[PDB]
Amino acid sequence: SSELNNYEKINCNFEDGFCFWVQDLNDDNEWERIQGSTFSPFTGPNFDHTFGNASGFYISTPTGPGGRQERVGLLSLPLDPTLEPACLSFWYHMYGENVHKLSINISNDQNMEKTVFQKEGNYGDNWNYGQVTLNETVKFKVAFNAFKNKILSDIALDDISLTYGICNGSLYPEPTLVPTPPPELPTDCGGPFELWEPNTTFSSTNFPNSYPNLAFCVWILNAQKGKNIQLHFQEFDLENINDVVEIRDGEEADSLLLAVYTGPGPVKDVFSTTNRMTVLLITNDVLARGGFKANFTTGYHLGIPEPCKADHFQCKNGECVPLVNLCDGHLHCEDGSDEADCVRFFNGTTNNNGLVRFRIQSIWHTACAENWTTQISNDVCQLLGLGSGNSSKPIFPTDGGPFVKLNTAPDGHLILTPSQQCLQDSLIRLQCNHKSCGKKLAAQDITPK
Amino acid sequence: IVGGSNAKEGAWPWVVGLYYGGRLLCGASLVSSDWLVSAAACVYGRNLEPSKWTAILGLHMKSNLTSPQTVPRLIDEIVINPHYNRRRKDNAIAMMHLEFKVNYTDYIQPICLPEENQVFPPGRNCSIAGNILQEADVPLLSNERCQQQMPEYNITENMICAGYEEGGIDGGPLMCQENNRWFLAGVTSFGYKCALPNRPGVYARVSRFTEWIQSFLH
Amino acid sequence: APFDDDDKIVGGYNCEENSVPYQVSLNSGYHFCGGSLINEQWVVSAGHCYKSRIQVRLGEHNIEVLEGNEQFINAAKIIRHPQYDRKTLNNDIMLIKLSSRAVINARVSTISLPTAPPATGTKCLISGWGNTASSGADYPDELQCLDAPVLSQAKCEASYPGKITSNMFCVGDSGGPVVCNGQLQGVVSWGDGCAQKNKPGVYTKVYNYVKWIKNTIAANS
């Protein structure tokens, strides 16, 4: 105890093992020793200060990626009463992105602590020489506390050289500790803006390399009045839903959406309608991809095929059917626009009510009810998207339009003939109820509990 | 629902689940035999590959998928609302088309769309739905109190709120019975913090998009 | 305004992917790495995730909420790769033998071994409980999945000069399974930062270790 020297008690190389020390016995973390390198790479240095070649033993954080924080404190014990201060020579290896602070406190037998030393940040890549004196005379329960923070917070230390007296002039200070946790503070949120005359070739923000994350750019493709916008792509390689491109066609406060493409592979082109195509970039912070190109080419009616005039009905997909599929019972146009609903109501209070307004091919008109039965009643109910025929009765002939004679036949389709030969025509006031909506159809019981 | 009771098998035939690559991703309301209606905030960015999506119709229990009441269907077309936004988050609805037609069986029935000029008054108790499909009663609230409780975001008329004032029990449709018939008063869109007080929950008002939904049912 | 869509109901987990039967969570008091279930008695993981005691949690979806379909099987023996270069993280792949055979069901099954090397642009499924933010520490308790096409070898070597080996190729996340077209082609090994510029993820090719895995299983079954 008394005969044991204080230097050998404090100063320790811990090459083969720890010297006579008190490291951790009560806290929830225990320091570990790293032989040059270990698992979880980028753990400070790859060697110690003495050996320095792939085989040096140095103390560091107990583990690598920690789930939560752990308080690690190197304890000590009082020493003999020394008049002169105590020179403490050491070299730390503080480095990392989530590094925390470490303090050196002094305790006594009167429940009094002091905290004056504290450092945090990345101090170079090698061992940074440091020195600090001690103004403790007799009673001093000093300690070296730290914290096991999240990933990228490993701190190393080696070759404690606490001596007595005052050492020589310390001329090896820390050159510059750069704050890594705020590496660059990305808050640009800018770049290219609303474009102009066709300078089609342009980078998005950093196109000739993988793009960085957290970037929120915007490209408002505009043109002259009456000109649409085209968005042909020569190369498209993005990430999943986390990285999408919400192509907008607002032109005002009420923004509209046209298409949202993502992922790798050449996606289809976009054909806007107005003269302002707003292109916003939405990227996540995980696994940023390469990017894509965009060469807009303005014009007139791009994408949408030119409709054929001179009695050529153009269905919503671009196909032309002059008179072969003008609501006659065929499915030429695959979008269903050729066989669209050429029937509706008239003077109807609710949705499933009104007149018997019918269009044979071009002009809308009424009908007649001389041979009206329940069969054609439910037929026109189903054709109008309704349920079964609840009731039907005429009121009075309103107009003298080209009404059609409805007929029935076992072939399924109804026979129609727009003959204008009918006195006191009875206009059908169709009263059809709704179909099987969201009502309880199963055999449910009554268990109010 | 956390504070919800188990619903009877067959009481909600218009409640199905959407599977994205074999995984239940979002809810949908079966409107027609070939077109469904779901929220756009959950199916966004996935409309490029409709073949990966698949809808299990008549699904009540995930472990009881071997029952013949569950009719699988494949998606081939996804239509997102044009007025959808990710920053403003307005009009988050999207329809999905089915590959083949399905028959209205005992456990597969279409839902009713809210007709125009029909506003649901506040304070109307009606439960919702969407392993075990539980349900819980959810009353209707006003837009003024809903905006005053959450002043961080502007809730316009295009959406309607419905939920408990004190919280605790909060893609699913907002089914509210009207004249012995259930309607589609909204879809379960989002929630700031579940099981927290003063969290009614804003739902997309379907009554403002009746003509938009009916235009694709044919 | 659906700005935070997390008020879902029965089913529909809170913003996380599911239906990944080969995804297992290695637990030693806290989630640290993932795994890959290839059979009923072996789990594939990263070599740097080696620990003394690891509880292989099978069928885990929420690491903090018990759903009733989890399988907790302790690790019987862990055999790392003999040529595992700890300095360069080469051969970053190890095998974890389960103490008991897992119950194969609809939620826990096996993954097929790779029979062909992954070509450039092949779509792959990656799962894990890793960080979702490039800055800070935001590790939620939810399982997220991410798809990514396989990048070319030239760009992969250019992004990491002198760091990409023949067994590596670019495409909590440590040890995550990278299954491409129903075949486990890659294993998450390391990466410079969290989604840094021109820094894609580094993955170990299991196609070069198929024979080693087969020989290790046959000699330890």
**Dihedral Cα B213, B215, B217, C5, nearest 10 deg:** -20
Contact C26, C34 (CB under 8 A): yes
The answer on A135 and A41 residing in a single domain is yes
C146 touches chain A (CB under 8 A): yes
CA distance A238 to A216: 15
Paired residues of C168 in beta bridges: C204
Rg (CA), chain C: 17
C142 marked as part of a ligand binding site? no
The answer on A23 and A155 residing in a single domain is yes
- The answer to whether residue A440 sits within a structural domain is no
Angle (nearest 5°) at CA A393 between A391 and A396: 155
Contacts of C82 (CB under 8 A, 6+ apart): none
The answer on A140 and A153 residing in a single domain is yes
- The answer to whether residue A12 sits within a structural domain is yes
Of B45, B83, B106, the CB nearest to A442: B106
End-to-end distance of chain C based on CA atoms, in angstroms? 56
The answer on A126 and A77 residing in a single domain is yes
C70 marked as part of a ligand binding site? yes
Contact C44, C36 (CB under 8 A): yes
**C141-144 contacts at long range (C-beta below 8 A, 24 or more positions apart):** C141/C62, C141/C63, C141/C64, C141/C65, C142/C13, C142/C14, C142/C15, C142/C16, C142/C62, C143/C16, C143/C17, C143/C18, C143/C20, C143/C23, C143/C61, C143/C62, C144/C16, C144/C17
If we measure between CA atoms, which residue out of C120, C107, C140 comes closest to residue C16? Answer: C140
Do the chains contact at C8 and B188, CB–CB below 8 Å? yes
The rounded Cα A183 to chain-centroid distance in angstroms is: 23
> Which residue, chain included where needed, has tokens 């072939």?
A411
- The answer to whether residue A399 sits within a structural domain is yes
**CB count, 10 Å around CB of A351?**
16
**Chain A with chain C: Cβ pairs closer than 8 A:** 69
Contacts of B131 (CB under 8 A, 6+ apart): B61, B62, B63, C10, C11
A284 touches chain C (CB under 8 A): yes
Q: Please give the DSSP secondary-structure letter assigned to residue C167.
A: T
The answer on A146 and A73 residing in a single domain is yes
A210 touches chain C (CB under 8 A): yes
Q: Report the CATH number that the domain containing residue A50 is assigned in CATH.
A: 2.60.120.200
Instruction: Provide the 3-class DSSP secondary structure of residue C58.
Output: strand
* Chain A residues within 8 A of C200 when measuring between CB atoms: 210, 287
If we measure between CA atoms, which residue out of C188, C181, C89 comes closest to residue C129? Answer: C188
Backbone φ, ψ for residue A382 (5° rounding):
-70, -35
Contact A91, A47 (CB under 8 A): no
**CB count, 10 Å around CB of B118?**
11
If we measure between CA atoms, which residue out of C195, C117, B186, B86 comes closest to residue A215? Answer: C195
Q: Catalytic one among C25, C159, C174, C189?
A: C174
The answer on A99 and A28 residing in a single domain is yes
Structure-block tokens of residue B173: 């449709």
Structure-block tokens of residue A183: 């590496």
CA distance A131 to A51: 22
Contact A65, A150 (CB under 8 A): yes
Type and span of the H or E element at A282: strand A276-282
DSSP string for A337-351: -TT---B--SS-SST
Backbone φ, ψ for residue A137 (5° rounding):
-100, -60
CA distance A95 to A40: 14
Size of chain A, expressed as the number of residues it contains = 449
Instruction: Provide the 3-class DSSP secondary structure of residue C13.
Output: coil
Domains of chain C in sequence order: 24-110+210-218 (2.40.10.10), 123-207 (2.40.10.10)
Q: Report the CATH number that the domain containing residue A260 is assigned in CATH.
A: 2.60.120.290
The answer on A124 and A144 residing in a single domain is yes
Size of chain B, expressed as the number of residues it contains = 218
Q: Do strands A141-148 and A70-75 pair parallel, antiparallel, or not at all (unpaired)?
A: antiparallel
Structure-block tokens of residue A202: 């342009």
Instruction: Provide the 3-class DSSP secondary structure of residue C79.
Output: strand
Of C87, C89, C195, the CB nearest to A286: C195
- The answer to whether residue A421 sits within a structural domain is yes
Task: Give me the resolution in angstroms, 1 decimal.
Answer: 4.9
Chain C nearest CA to A190, separation (Å): 17
Do the chains contact at C5 and B24, CB–CB below 8 Å? no
Q: How many domains does chain A have?
A: 4
Please tell me the experimental approach by which this structure was elucidated. Answer: cryo-EM
Contact A102, A74 (CB under 8 A): no
C181 marked as part of a ligand binding site? no
CA distance B140 to B201: 10
C171 marked as part of a ligand binding site? no
Contact A141, A76 (CB under 8 A): yes
Type and span of the H or E element at A404: none
Of A336, A437, A447, the CB nearest to B112: A437
CA distance B22 to B18: 9
Do the chains contact at B4 and C10, CB–CB below 8 Å? yes
Chain C nearest CA to B129, separation (Å): 8
Contacts of C204 (CB under 8 A, 6+ apart): C46, C91, C92, C93, C167, C168, C186, C187, C189
* Chain C residues within 8 A of B24 when measuring between CB atoms: 11-12, 18
Q: Spell out a b/e string for A126-160, using b for 16 or more CB atoms within 10 Å of the CB, else e.
A: ebbebbeebebeeebebebbbbbbbbbbbbbbbbb
Of A255, A436, A443, the CB nearest to B85: A255
Paired residues of A59 in beta bridges: A33, A157
The answer on A404 and A314 residing in a single domain is no
CA distance B159 to B190: 12
Q: Do strands A257-261 and A291-292 pair parallel, antiparallel, or not at all (unpaired)?
A: unpaired
A37 touches chain C (CB under 8 A): yes
C48 in active site: yes
End-to-end distance of chain B based on CA atoms, in angstroms? 34
The answer on A133 and A33 residing in a single domain is yes
AA identity, residue C111: I
Rg (CA), chain A: 42
* Chain C residues within 8 A of B155 when measuring between CB atoms: 1
Contact C107, C69 (CB under 8 A): yes
DSSP string for A283-325: --SSS---EE------BSS-SSPPPP-SS--B-TTS-B-SSTT
Do the chains contact at A287 and C133, CB–CB below 8 Å? no
Q: Catalytic one among C61, C92, C127, C173?
A: C92
- The answer to whether residue A105 sits within a structural domain is yes
Do the chains contact at A285 and C135, CB–CB below 8 Å? yes
C99 in active site: no
- The answer to whether residue A320 sits within a structural domain is yes
Instruction: Provide the 3-class DSSP secondary structure of residue C186.
Output: strand
Report CA-CA distances (Å) from A99 to A66, A123, A407, B45: 12, 11, 87, 38
Of A38, A210, A287, the CB nearest to C197: A210
The CATH superfamily holding the domain B15-111+209-215 is Trypsin-like serine proteases (2.40.10.10)
Contacts of A114 (CB under 8 A, 6+ apart): A105, A106
- The answer to whether residue A348 sits within a structural domain is no
The answer on A157 and A46 residing in a single domain is yes
CA distance B141 to B143: 7
Backbone φ, ψ for residue C154 (5° rounding):
-65, -50
**Chain A with chain B: Cβ pairs closer than 8 A:** 79
Angle (nearest 5°) at CA A402 between A398 and A405: 95
Contact A265, B49 (CB under 8 A): no
The answer on A392 and A380 residing in a single domain is yes
What is the strand order of the sheet A353-354 is part of?
Answer: A353-354, A429-432, A389-393
Of A256, A350, A442, the CB nearest to B11: A442
Which subunits have 3 or more CB–CB pairs within 8 Å of chain A? B, C
| Domain span holding position A361 | 353-432
Contacts of A346 (CB under 8 A, 6+ apart): A354, A355, A356, A357, A366
Chain C nearest CA to A122, separation (Å): 16
Do the chains contact at B170 and C3, CB–CB below 8 Å? no
Contact B78, B52 (CB under 8 A): no
Contact A268, A236 (CB under 8 A): no
CA distance A380 to C70: 57
**CB count, 10 Å around CB of A391?**
10
SS (H, E, C) chain B: CCCCEECCCCCCCCEEEEEECCCEEEEEEECCCCEEEECCCCCCCCCCCCCCEEEEECCCECCCCCCCCCEEEEEEEEEECCCCCCCCCCCCCEEEEECCCCCCCCCCCCCCCCCCCCCCCCCCCEECCCCECEECEECECCHHHHHHHCCCCCCCCCEEEECCCCCCCCCCEEEEECCCCEEEEEEECCECCCCCCCCCCEEECHHHCHHHHHHHHC
CA distance A5 to A197: 83
Domain final position from A162, A193, A209: A162
If we measure between CA atoms, which residue out of A257, A256, A247 comes closest to residue A296? Answer: A247
Q: Search chain B and give the residue with CA nearest A385.
A: B218
- The answer to whether residue A346 sits within a structural domain is no
Do the chains contact at A213 and C149, CB–CB below 8 Å? no
* Chain C residues within 8 A of B4 when measuring between CB atoms: 9-10
Do the chains contact at C134 and A240, CB–CB below 8 Å? no
Report CA-CA distances (Å) from C2 to B48, B140, B161, B162, C75: 22, 18, 12, 14, 43
Report CA-CA distances (Å) from B29 to A126, B5, B113, B160, B170: 63, 20, 10, 17, 19
Contact B3, B15 (CB under 8 A): no
Chain C nearest CA to B180, separation (Å): 25
Structure-block tokens of residue A127: 């061992």
Contacts of C113 (CB under 8 A, 6+ apart): C38, C183, C184, C206, C210, C213
C147 in active site: no
Contact C107, C59 (CB under 8 A): yes
Backbone φ, ψ for residue A2 (5° rounding):
-70, -40
Paired residues of A392 in beta bridges: A430
Do the chains contact at C31 and A67, CB–CB below 8 Å? yes
> Which residue, chain included where needed, has tokens 């297992």?
C24
If we measure between CA atoms, which residue out of B76, B75, B164, B183 comes closest to residue B125? Answer: B164
CA distance C139 to C172: 8
Cα within 13 Å of Cα(C175), Cβ side: 28
Which subunits have 3 or more CB–CB pairs within 8 Å of chain C? A, B
Structure-block tokens of residue B98: 């089915």
Contact A92, A159 (CB under 8 A): no
Structure-block tokens of residue B27: 């809810």
